[PDB]
């Protein structure tokens, strides 16, 4: 029973780690987009 539980836990864990890496990459892309948007906004504010 403990071996089966451990295998299921490892499967959930490896899958969870892959999900965390994907979420981190998406967050980094979002942050870069936000920084570009902020620079564009500052330029627009100065022109306004």
């Amino acid at each position: 029973t403990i071996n089966q539980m451990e295998i299921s836990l490892k499967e959930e864990e490896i899958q969870l780690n892959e999900a965390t890496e994907k979420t981190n990459q998406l967050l980094a892309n979002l942050d870069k987009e936000s920084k570009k948007a902020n620079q564009k906004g500052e330029e627009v504010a100065a022109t306004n």
Binding site: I2, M5, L9, L16, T20, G41, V44, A45, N48
Partner: protein
């Protein structure tokens, strides 16, 4: 200027959404980290 003001209002709304979205993402990341720590503790207990 009126067009710029409409664009500026849209930009402010987008920034608030990004900021609120970023806080939600950070909360999700913290929950994921807590889940990962619990899973790692469970794996160590399982190995012992």
């Amino acid at each position: 200027l009126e067009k710029a003001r409409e664009d500026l209002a849209q930009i402010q709304a987008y920034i608030k959404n990004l900021k609120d979205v970023y806080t939600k993402q950070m909360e999700e990341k913290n929950e994921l980290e807590m889940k990962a720590a619990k899973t790692k503790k469970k794996i160590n207990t399982a190995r012992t």
